[PDB]
DNA sequence: GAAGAGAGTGAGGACGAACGCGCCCCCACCCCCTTTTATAGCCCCCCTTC
DNA sequence: GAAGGGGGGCTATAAAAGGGGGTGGGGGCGCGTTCGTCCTCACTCTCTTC
């Protein structure tokens, strides 16, 4: 119950932590926290705003030690990708992780898929799937005033 | 003549031995090979009214150690050995004490500093981190210990309700080993559900109050 | 079990056999057959014959053979009333309701039929103790009488004051 | 006429019953187990290519 | 031996069954301290004694 309450309190305050992040600090598994999470909402008759891809960019990018411009580029990519519906049904975390990878590979600081997965808690396969979906529209997603250390045309293909 | 007897023959012969205090580096060099049968030569020179003792390090070993004698009248020292076959003996009696000193003064301390620094290698100091560690509490769907424990429980499965006759036979058979059993321990032996086991135990068994630890179940129906 | 497990099954099998309604006695060897204890030790065969089957209060020695003891156990309303009467007459004490229930099947019918003849005392653990209702001298009064009687505190008075009241009122 | 053991009183030291302080246990109460299903994403293990 | 892909699994969603297992709340119950009860002892009067 406490782990779910901690998750809900984070969501209510505008700084969500993913179920995996709450699980890492608790002996309770993600499955159990999610079960308690839904029950608490019914019991309290409350609701939580739907999470967005940008709700985790600050934590993920900072934890990856990525420059601020990369963080802004990743946020723009993730927001645009959802706007363009290039990743329908994908989890916001996966979209954010893919956007971070796309932004990271376009700057001097390059992070592997495993590195982005560890902080974000998303398996590299899921990042690979999301990255493949947004890769075709890479030039459009990137901010117009973005300095490409690696040209968009030469971004990793996979 | 017994195992604890000490072979005091050396004392009878009044054999004389010398006790020498030497630094580690001299012994460390000897310990390097320690099997060549040679580490150096001990040279003693005597004059009309003065005697000097000095030791020379082997040339191969290196790739002057003056000796100063000490008074031995203030204390009596004897040397004995413990044989591996449990046969203790007295090697002899110390007749003179000497000390080994380094000939060099200035550059010698350099080796001492390295020895101190070498002794400081195991010594450990706190280290600075330029960046904050972010690999702690990494997001995980379920803890590795939790899933392994669940896998073991799932594989093992829940205990089944065995027929009363089989359970009764097992309970009676185990009664021979010990007079009284604990409910928790008895469950492990029988490997049956607690509720079912208690009902079977209640049908015949009873619990006796003991003032030493607590009331425990007794397998004897009477 | 060796020297201890076999006897338990004999008692259990004997108890179950009586519940079927077979009052006929059974021999030691006969009982062993249905209890899968044919390989019982010889010294246990004599031990059960000499000690276990006689000292126990539920074993009756009839014509050499052994039979249950339903007579001692209460199995009728009249026996239930008689047992309580003897307990009161001899001052043996009450009997827990659970003990009567197991001995007397459908003890509720007998208990309700006797009605007030049985005095029930509720233990802290919900256990009921049955006592004979000695109808020699009875005295029941209204509740408020006891309330007023309880209102008259007497434990907090000394003997001198208690006895002084007698001469104070002139009695 | 002149003085010993013993006891009241003052006053100090050791051990048991009661009060906690929890260790353990027993007992409700709940959740989990299982199967079925379509769906979608996410994730992990094994096989394959280089 | 590193990395990608295929196959498989986990999760939620209802509902029902019956029973094992985990868990919170009491309830009798043994063990480490604490105070009162019991016991011990110094300093004098006293009846009795001489």
UniProtKB/Swiss-Prot annotation, chain A:
The keyword Disulfide bond does not apply. Residues 31-35, 91-94, 125-128 are annotated as: Core promoter DNA-binding. One of its GO terms (biological process) is meiotic sister chromatid cohesion. It is found in: Nucleus; Chromosome. DNA binds at residues 31, 38, 90, 114, 123, 126, 128, 132. Changing residue 31 to E: Inhibits interaction with SSU72. Reduces interaction with SSU72. Inhibits interaction with VP16. Inhibits RNA pol II transcription activation induced by VP16 but does not affect basal transcription. Its EC number is 2.3.1.48. Changing residue 27 to E: Reduces interaction with SSU72. Inhibits interaction with VP16. Inhibits RNA pol II transcription activation induced by VP16 but does not affect basal transcription. Residues 86-158 are annotated as: Necessary for TATA box-bound TBP complex formation. GO terms for molecular function: acetyltransferase activity; DNA-binding transcription factor binding; histone acetyltransferase activity; nuclear thyroid hormone receptor binding; promoter-specific chromatin binding; RNA polymerase II complex binding; RNA polymerase II core promoter sequence-specific DNA binding; RNA polymerase II general transcription initiation factor activity. The chain holds residues 159 to 316 of 316 of the full protein. The modification N6-acetyllysine is found at residue 80. Changing residue 27 to L: Reduces interaction with VP16. This is Transcription initiation factor IIB. Changing residue 128 to A: Reduces DNA-binding. Acetylated. Autoacetylated; autoacetylation at Lys-80 stimulates transcription activation. One of its GO terms (cellular component) is germinal vesicle. Changing residue 38 to L: Reduces interaction with VP16.
Curated annotation (Swiss-Prot), chain B:
GO terms for biological process: positive regulation of transcription by RNA polymerase II; transcription by RNA polymerase II; transcription elongation by RNA polymerase II; transcription initiation at RNA polymerase II promoter. GO terms for molecular function: DNA binding; RNA polymerase II general transcription initiation factor activity. Pfam families: TFIIF_beta, TFIIF_beta_N. GO terms for cellular component: microtubule cytoskeleton; nucleoplasm; nucleus; transcription factor TFIIF complex. It is found in: Nucleus. The modification N6-acetyllysine is found at residues 21, 32, 121. Keywords: Acetylation, DNA-binding, Nucleus, Phosphoprotein, Transcription, Transcription regulation. The modification N-acetylalanine is found at residue 1. DNA binds at residues 211, 213. CDD domains: TFIIF_beta. InterPro entries: TFIIF_beta, TFIIF_beta_HTH, TFIIF_beta_N, TFIIF_interaction, WH-like_DNA-bd_sf, WH_DNA-bd_sf. Its main location: nucleus. The modification Phosphoserine is found at residue 126. Heterodimer of an alpha and a beta subunit. Interacts with HTATSF1 and GPBP1. Interacts with URI1. Interacts with GTF2B (via N-terminus); this interaction is inhibited in presence of GTF2F1. Belongs to the TFIIF beta subunit family. TFIIF is a general transcription initiation factor that binds to RNA polymerase II and helps to recruit it to the initiation complex in collaboration with TFIIB. This is General transcription factor IIF subunit 2. The gene is GTF2F2.
From Swiss-Prot, chain C:
Changing residue 116 to Y: In TTD6; reduction in the levels of both TFIIE-alpha and TFIIE-beta subunits of the TFIIE complex in patient cells; reduced phosphorylation of TFIIE-alpha observed in patient cells. Its main location: nucleus. Signal peptide: none annotated. One of its GO terms (molecular function) is RNA polymerase II general transcription initiation factor activity. Coiled coil: none annotated. It is found in: Nucleus. Keywords: Acetylation, Disease variant, DNA-binding, Nucleus, Phosphoprotein, Transcription, Transcription regulation. Residues 1-75 bind DNA. GO terms for cellular component: cytosol; nucleoplasm; transcription factor TFIID complex; transcription factor TFIIE complex. The modification N6-acetyllysine is found at residue 3. GO terms for biological process: transcription by RNA polymerase II; transcription initiation at RNA polymerase II promoter. Tetramer of two alpha and two beta chains. Interacts with FACT subunit SUPT16H. Interacts with ATF7IP. Interacts with SND1. Part of TBP-based Pol II pre-initiation complex (PIC), in which Pol II core assembles with general transcription factors and other specific initiation factors including GTF2E1, GTF2E2, GTF2F1, GTF2F2, TCEA1, ERCC2, ERCC3, GTF2H2, GTF2H3, GTF2H4, GTF2H5, GTF2A1, GTF2A2, GTF2B and TBP; this large multi-subunit PIC complex mediates DNA unwinding and targets Pol II core to the transcription start site where the first phosphodiester bond forms. Recruits TFIIH to the initiation complex and stimulates the RNA polymerase II C-terminal domain kinase and DNA-dependent ATPase activities of TFIIH. Both TFIIH and TFIIE are required for promoter clearance by RNA polymerase. Belongs to the TFIIE beta subunit family. This is Transcription initiation factor IIE subunit beta. It comes from Homo sapiens. The chain holds residues 72 to 242 of 291 of the full protein.
